[PDB]
C-alpha cells in the first residue's frame, strides 16, 4: 500500500553477509526471511545460522553448497523444531557433519507461505509481512559488477533462477 | 527504471551499495524476482 | 543433445545454488559461463573446461573456435 517501505528501518534486518565460494545463497535467503519473522514476533534481532542448514537440511531435499531452496529450508526448522543461532553455530563455507544443539536453538518455524507469482502480490507481502525471500537470475557479468543506480539487464530471465536474495523493501526516485 | 526492489545479497558489504542492490521493479517481473517468492510462519 | 545441453537438462528452472551452464543455438558451451549464487564469470574451452586464470568479477574476453 505505502509508496515505500525499507525494513532496514525497523530493525528486521541484519547486517550484509558473505557465503563464500559455496552455494548455500538458499540459506542465506532463508535465515534472512526468518530473522525478521522472529524480530516482529519477539521484538528480538537475533542472526540465525546458516551452517546449520547447510549441514542438517540433506532430508528435506537441500543439498549443502551445490544448492537448495528456501522452502525446504523453512520445513527443516519445522521438522526440527528449531534452528540455532550464528554465534553458537557458525559458518564454514562447506558442508559439514550436522551439529545442531537444541539448547542453542533461537528460531522456530511453522511452515511456510508460497507468493504467487505476480509483482502486484510480492509488493503486498512486503508492505504487510517484512523481508521475503526470492530467487532471481543472478548469473549475467552486469550483476558481478553492479555499484549504484536501478540494475536492469535485457538478457535477464524470469523463468530460470540461479540465486537466493532477500527482499527489504521497494520505492522510487525522487521528482 | 524509476520503481525499484530493494534486495540483500550475501557476497559480503564489498559488493554493490553495501552488500545491497536496487533491482527494477514493475519491468514485467524482470531477472525472476516475483517468480519464486516465500516467507516462513511463525 | 550435447554435453552442454544434458547438463543444462538436468538442472531445474528455479536453482539457487547450483551451476547450470548456458549453451548457444548449436549446443556448445558459450565461452563465458557464470555461476549466479557465487557471484562469478570464467571463460571454458568448447568441452566445458574452465580457462586457467579466467575466474573473477570483472569483464571477459572469451573466445571460441
Ligand atoms: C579440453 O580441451 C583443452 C584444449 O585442447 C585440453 O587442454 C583439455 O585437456 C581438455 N579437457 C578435457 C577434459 O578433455
Not at chain 1, 138 to 147: N, P, R, T
Not at chain 1, 149 to 158: L, N
Given at each position: 500500500?505505502?509508496?515505500?517501505?525499507?525494513?532496514?528501518?525497523?530493525?528486521?534486518?541484519?547486517?550484509?553477509?558473505?557465503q563464500?565460494?559455496?552455494?548455500?545463497?538458499?540459506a542465506?535467503?532463508?535465515?534472512?526471511?526468518?530473522e525478521?519473522?522472529?524480530?516482529?514476533?519477539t521484538?528480538?534481532?537475533?542472526?540465525?545460522?546458516?551452517?546449520?542448514?547447510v549441514?542438517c537440511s540433506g532430508?528435506?531435499?537441500?543439498?549443502?553448497?551445490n544448492?537448495?531452496?528456501?522452502?525446504?529450508?523453512?520445513?527443516?526448522?519445522?521438522?526440527?523444531?528449531?534452528?540455532?543461532?550464528?554465534?553458537?553455530?557458525?559458518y564454514?563455507?562447506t558442508?559439514?557433519?550436522?551439529?545442531?544443539?537444541?539448547?542453542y536453538s533461537?528460531?522456530?518455524?511453522?511452515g511456510?507461505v508460497?507468493?504467487?507469482?505476480?509483482?502486484?502480490?510480492?509488493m503486498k507481502a512486503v508492505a504487510?509481512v517484512?523481508?521475503?525471500?526470492?530467487?532471481?537470475?543472478?548469473?549475467h557479468?552486469?550483476?558481478?559488477?553492479?555499484?549504484?543506480?536501478i540494475?536492469?539487464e535485457?538478457?535477464?530471465?524470469?523463468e530460470?533462477?540461479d540465486?537466493?536474495?532477500?527482499?527489504?523493501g521497494?520505492?522510487?526516485?525522487?521528482? | 527504471?524509476?520503481?525499484?526492489?530493494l534486495?540483500?545479497?550475501?557476497?559480503?558489504?564489498?559488493?554493490?551499495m553495501?552488500?545491497y542492490?536496487?533491482?527494477?521493479k514493475?519491468?514485467?517481473?524482470?531477472?525472476?524476482?516475483?517468480s519464486?517468492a516465500?516467507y516462513?510462519?511463525? | 543433445?550435447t554435453?552442454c545441453q544434458?547438463?543444462?537438462?538436468?538442472?531445474?528452472?528455479?536453482?539457487?545454488?547450483?551451476?547450470?551452464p548456458?549453451?548457444?543455438?548449436?549446443?556448445?558451451?558459450?565461452?563465458?559461463?557464470?555461476?549466479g549464487?557465487?557471484?562469478?564469470?570464467?571463460?571454458?574451452?568448447?568441452?566445458?573446461?574452465?580457462?586457467?586464470?579466467?575466474?573473477?568479477?570483472?569483464?571477459?574476453?572469451?573466445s571460441?573456435?
Amino acid at each position: 500500500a505505502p509508496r515505500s517501505v525499507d525494513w532496514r528501518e525497523k530493525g528486521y534486518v541484519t547486517p550484509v553477509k558473505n557465503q563464500g565460494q559455496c552455494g548455500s545463497c538458499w540459506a542465506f535467503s532463508a535465515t534472512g526471511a526468518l530473522e525478521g519473522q522472529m524480530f516482529r514476533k519477539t521484538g528480538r534481532l537475533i542472526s540465525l545460522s546458516e551452517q546449520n542448514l547447510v549441514d542438517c537440511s540433506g532430508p528435506q531435499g537441500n543439498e549443502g553448497c551445490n544448492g537448495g531452496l528456501m522452502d525446504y529450508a523453512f520445513q527443516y526448522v519445522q521438522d526440527n523444531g528449531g534452528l540455532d543461532s550464528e554465534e553458537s553455530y557458525p559458518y564454514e563455507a562447506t558442508e559439514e557433519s550436522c551439529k545442531y544443539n537444541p539448547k542453542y536453538s533461537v528460531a522456530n518455524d511453522t511452515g511456510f507461505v508460497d507468493i504467487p507469482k505476480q509483482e502486484k502480490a510480492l509488493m503486498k507481502a512486503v508492505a504487510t509481512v517484512g523481508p521475503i525471500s526470492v530467487a532471481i537470475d543472478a548469473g549475467h557479468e552486469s550483476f558481478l559488477f553492479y555499484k549504484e543506480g536501478i540494475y536492469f539487464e535485457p538478457d535477464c530471465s524470469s523463468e530460470d533462477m540461479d540465486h537466493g536474495v532477500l527482499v527489504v523493501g521497494y520505492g522510487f526516485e525522487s521528482t | 527504471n524509476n520503481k525499484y526492489w530493494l534486495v540483500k545479497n550475501s557476497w559480503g558489504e564489498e559488493w554493490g551499495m553495501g552488500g545491497y542492490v536496487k533491482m527494477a521493479k514493475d519491468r514485467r517481473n524482470h531477472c525472476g524476482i516475483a517468480s519464486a517468492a516465500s516467507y516462513p510462519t511463525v | 543433445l550435447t554435453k552442454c545441453q544434458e547438463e543444462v537438462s538436468h538442472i531445474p528452472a528455479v536453482h539457487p545454488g547450483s551451476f547450470r551452464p548456458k549453451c548457444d543455438e548449436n549446443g556448445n558451451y558459450l565461452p563465458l559461463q557464470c555461476y549466479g549464487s557465487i557471484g562469478y564469470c570464467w571463460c571454458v574451452f568448447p568441452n566445458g573446461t574452465e580457462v586457467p586464470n579466467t575466474r573473477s568479477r570483472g569483464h571477459h574476453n572469451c573466445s571460441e573456435s
